[PDB]
Swiss-Prot record, chain A:
PANTHER family cross-referenced by the UniProt entry: 30S RIBOSOMAL PROTEIN S20, SMALL RIBOSOMAL SUBUNIT PROTEIN BS20C
GO biological process terms on file: translation
Cited SUPFAM superfamilies: Ribosomal protein S20
One GO MF term: structural constituent of ribosome
Lineage top rank: taxon: Bacteria
Keywords on record: Ribonucleoprotein, Ribosomal protein, RNA-binding, rRNA-binding
Protein name per UniProt: Small ribosomal subunit protein bS20
Entry keyword rRNA-binding: yes
Keyword Glycosyltransferase attributed: no
Annotated gene: rpsT
Pfam families noted in UniProt: Ribosomal_S20p
From Swiss-Prot, chain B:
Domain of life: Bacteria
Annotated protein name in UniProt: Small ribosomal subunit protein bS16
Record key words, sorted: Ribonucleoprotein, Ribosomal protein
Quaternary data: Part of the 30S ribosomal subunit.
From Swiss-Prot, chain C:
The protein's name in its UniProt record: Small ribosomal subunit protein uS17
GO BP: translation
Gene3D superfamilies: Nucleic acid-binding proteins (2.40.50.140)
One family name in Pfam for this protein: Ribosomal_S17
Keywords: Ribonucleoprotein, Ribosomal protein, RNA-binding, rRNA-binding
Gene Ontology molecular-function annotations: rRNA binding; structural constituent of ribosome
Family under the similarity heading: Belongs to the universal ribosomal protein uS17 family.
Functional summary from the UniProt entry: One of the primary rRNA binding proteins, it binds specifically to the 5'-end of 16S ribosomal RNA.
One GO cellular component term noted in the UniProt record for this chain: cytosolic small ribosomal subunit
The keyword tRNA processing is annotated on this UniProt entry: no
UniProt-listed InterPro entries: NA-bd_OB-fold, Ribosomal_uS17, Ribosomal_uS17_bact/chlr, Ribosomal_uS17_CS
Quaternary structure (record): Part of the 30S ribosomal subunit.
From Swiss-Prot, chain E:
Entry-linked InterPro entries: Ribosomal_uL14 (IPR000218), Ribosomal_uL14_bac-type (IPR005745), Ribosomal_uL14_CS (IPR019972), Ribosomal_uL14_sf (IPR036853)
This protein's encoding gene: rplN
Pfam families per the UniProt record, alphabetical: Ribosomal_L14 (PF00238)
Listed name of the protein: Large ribosomal subunit protein uL14
Entry superkingdom: Bacteria
Naturally occurring in which organism (per UniProt): Bacillus subtilis (strain 168)
Length: 83, 88, 84, 86, 122
RNA sequence: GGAGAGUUUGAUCCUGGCUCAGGACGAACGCUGGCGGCGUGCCUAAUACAUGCAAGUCGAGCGGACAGAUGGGAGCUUGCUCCCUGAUGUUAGCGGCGGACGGGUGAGUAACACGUGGGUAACCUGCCUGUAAGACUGGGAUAACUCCGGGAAACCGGGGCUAAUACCGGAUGGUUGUUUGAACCGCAUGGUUCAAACAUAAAAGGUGGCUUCGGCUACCACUUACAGAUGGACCCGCGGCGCAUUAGCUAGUUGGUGAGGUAACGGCUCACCAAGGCGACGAUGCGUAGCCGACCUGAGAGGGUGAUCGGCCACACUGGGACUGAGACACGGCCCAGACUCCUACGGGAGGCAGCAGUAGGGAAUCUUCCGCAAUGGACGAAAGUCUGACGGAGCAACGCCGC
RNA sequence: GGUACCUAACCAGAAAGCCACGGCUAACUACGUGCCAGCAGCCGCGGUAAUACGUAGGUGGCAAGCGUUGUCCGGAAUUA
RNA sequence: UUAGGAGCCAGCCGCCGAAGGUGGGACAGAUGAUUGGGGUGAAGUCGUAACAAGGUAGCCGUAUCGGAAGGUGCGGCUGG
């Protein structure tokens, strides 16, 4: 309205791109947790590195804000410790 | 953001100024932390009075003033004493 | 380089039915800002009992911390004196 | 000279007695103009209803369509008595 | 197909909520009224904020009904609530808005201010 | 640093009422009114708003357009027409940061909102310094641009072209997490420090000079880490109201365990299990109202008020959600409904003055639709600069104080 | 904003009012008036000599203001 | 390496979820014919109940009757 139309034209374009980082981060965690219902540790090890690949790059991009991601790390990490 | 700066006081026509360490987010008459002495523009002579020592402790923490405030410190050598500390 | 000491009291326990926690009555008392006489109030809190060594009418100290649950903002220090 | 010669939004000379507010400007044209008047504009700016017109002015009227109506405040906002008898 | 002694959902914010009929203004005795006919009505309920309030003999126009409307195409319009829009005893309404759809068989007569205020002239 | 006076009565003293002299107004009205400084100036309607302005900034982030003529050359009418990219100039869009502050209003809110003192081992902090390190190697787009299509418009859709300090991979990293050791200490959770192992986690160039044409250099920006500076969030004692003709009130209520969730502690959310918690020191409820330094008054103790100026919270037509961003649930941002206004070719859309003014309307009653970024301030930028209804001043009314 | 300001030139020339006047409370007479018209914060004033009404003169009050009005405090030790 | 997987989105689905609708209670205010007392006003009518031993000593509490103040019953009180 006061020439801040340029914000909404970018805010929606960022809203698509940010959620693709966010939703793929969610699928990485469940696939690790899929290997918790599954009785596989070696599959969980390579998935933990696959999950933390997205997690560590997530705070590098935008709002995931590491103090969450530390809880995202260790909660996955004790399950591999549980196996 | 932390700008040591002036602060507008006094009557309508003849202003008065106080040199103030504060945050720029607070308004022109906004709040602050601790002040240094004075400024007088309406005197055709002198009487710009500075504490001359307390701001150097703040400059070692880092607080960038505007140049209209800063050249009063040059007139009393606060910055050049501080630049010696930066050369120290 | 000691950190700042927290809030602390001693007092007296009404009930024990709360799981691993109690209430403790503090009986400090003050004057009124208009007249001068000094009357007593009732100040009770919620305090953590990690050992469940509590009694009805127990003299005990309390120690605040980060809030452990809803309205629970204390833990014990020492069971000072017991009931009969 | 006891009358104001004001102008309508066409530009016709509107002969009204002197001391008129723009509420008095309405009833020379039509009475329902006064029934539907909200505000007024003289020469670019809006003018208040507290304004009294002068001889030789173009007066534009902020007129509602058929929505709005008068109050008790307007009964002494009629300076000229013949318009005040209206 | 609205008779005597039917109850109608009112389609404007002119004050009323539910309206009952008296007589269809046809001839000596007309039984029904599909669309566009003019009823003399009364007001069984009103909004608390009301220009027209409880118990007022009103004259109104049917807009939308559970009746057919045989166009010459063969298309039959049929809504799912009987209704009125209260008018000021003329070819003109007295409300501000008109809630919901309005049947296109009001343009056969000149009720065009209801047409111009309609949100979806179906 | 504490004046009293008239009145019950035929007359007196008490008793007890009201009355009166005083002091302030954000005050209004009546009558009059010469001027100058300094200061205030919608309390009712947080009711609705015509019109203009109130937040943009970087060509030194970047592609292209856009002019340009330093010269070069062309066709001739000597009047021109050009084709190359001069200096340099313009910035729709792109991208970076700001828009969360500055500014207003006083509606809800009787509670950790505020006032005061605290605590955090239970937290966060882009833009600030200072230190520690750095800044490797690639990739795929896409706007603008055009070319069509659909639309009354609002605008929207499709096909190619293209950039970057945009975006996305690979390396290396003292973040963090895991695993296993140590050391020390606190206030239980524990905390702090050190080692090893594993796991990933980056970055960017731009500006000007110097160049061996390989590059180098300062400067700006960049990634990461440490502190300090900086504000913010959460918790806690203690304070400032009216009614008992409001005495019973609450089931996520109150507890535990685990789980999820939040920057963070938590019934904050959910499962389970338990039945507690709140209360005559007045809960719950209801009417009422923003709080505070302070203002006025009193001799003081107190009482009243919470306007302007300064602190903080809350709200942005009414209500609810949410994104990007260090920071909002965003005063001049989006999405949804509710009322209302405006436009429409009826299919559709756009709008939010309790920003400055001004108007309507309300009311006893409150002001100028000015000029200026010169000073102070912010915003961005390397700076000039740009942008500023913050502010600077001018204008109105004896509104008040002082001065003539 | 040639605004403040200062310099020189000019004229008594531009310019005062409202309120009170029995007692509280400083200040009074004359006409009008006759429970009527009207005052009033308090006690209360007028059915023919109204210092209390209205007017005039004259005082007094304060001053670019004065009264009335609604507020809040005080006097009110009358929530002590 | 002529494409599959990963991931992503359109779409639909579920819980939550504001406004809307429905329903019986709470309290707040206007209004309601008529009535019930309560004061408040010019020599209205009816009685005399009080205050004197008030012409029957009054007075509180209860009961009861009458135009109405009141009347007496019973107990209590000196302010008989």
């Amino acid at each position: 309205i006061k020439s801040a139309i340029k914000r909404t034209k970018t805010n929606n374009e960022r809203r698509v791109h940010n959620a693709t980082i966010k939703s793929a981060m969610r699928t990485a965690i469940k696939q690790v947790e899929a290997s918790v219902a599954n009785n596989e540790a070696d599959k969980a090890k390579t998935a933990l590195t696959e999950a933390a690949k997205r997690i560590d790059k997530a705070v590098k991009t935008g709002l995931v804000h590491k103090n969450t991601a530390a809880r995202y790390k260790s909660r996955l990490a004790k399950k591999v410790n549980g196996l | 953001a932390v700008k040591i700066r002036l602060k507008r006081m006094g009557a309508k026509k003849s202003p008065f100024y106080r040199i103030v360490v504060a945050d720029s987010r607070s308004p022109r008459d906004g709040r602050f932390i601790e002040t240094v002495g004075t400024y007088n523009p309406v005197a055709k002579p002198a009487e710009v009075k500075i504490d001359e020592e307390l701001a150097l402790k703040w400059l070692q923490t880092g607080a960038k003033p505007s140049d209209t405030v800063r050249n009063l410190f040059s007139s009393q050598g606060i910055m050049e004493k501080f630049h010696n500390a930066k050369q120290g | 380089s000691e950190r700042n000491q927290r809030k602390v009291y001693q007092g007296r326990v009404v009930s024990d039915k709360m799981d691993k926690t109690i209430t403790v009555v503090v009986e400090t008392y003050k004057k009124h800002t208009l007249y001068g006489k000094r009357v007593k109030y009732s100040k009770k809190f919620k305090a953590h009992d990690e050992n469940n060594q509590a009694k009805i009418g127990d003299i005990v100290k309390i120690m605040e911390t980060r809030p452990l649950s809803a309205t629970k903002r204390f833990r014990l220090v020492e069971v000072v004196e017991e009931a009969v | 000279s006891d009358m104001v010669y004001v102008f309508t939004p066409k530009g016709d000379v509107i002969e009204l007695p002197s001391g008129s507010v723009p509420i008095d400007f309405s009833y020379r044209i039509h009475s329902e103009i006064g029934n539907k008047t909200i505000g007024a504009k003289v020469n670019g700016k809006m003018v208040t209803l507290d304004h009294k017109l002068r001889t030789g002015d173009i007066v534009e009227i902020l007129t509602s369509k058929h929505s709005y109506g008068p109050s008790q405040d307007w009964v002494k906002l009629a300076q000229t008595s013949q318009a005040k008898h209206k | 197909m609205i008779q005597q002694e039917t109850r109608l959902k009112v389609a404007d914010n002119s004050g009323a909520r539910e309206v009952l009929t008296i007589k269809v203004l046809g001839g000596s005795g007309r039984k029904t009224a599909n669309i566009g006919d003019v009823i003399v009505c009364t007001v069984k309920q009103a909004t608390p904020g009301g220009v027209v309030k409880k118990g007022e003999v009103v004259k109104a126009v049917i807009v939308r009904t559970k009746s057919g409307a045989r166009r010459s195409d063969g298309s039959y319009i049929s809504f799912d609530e009987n209704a009125c829009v209260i008018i000021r005893d003329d070819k003109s309404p007295r409300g501000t808005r008109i809630f919901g759809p309005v049947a296109r068989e009001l343009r056969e007569n000149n009720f065009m201010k209801i047409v111009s205020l309609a949100p979806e002239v179906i």
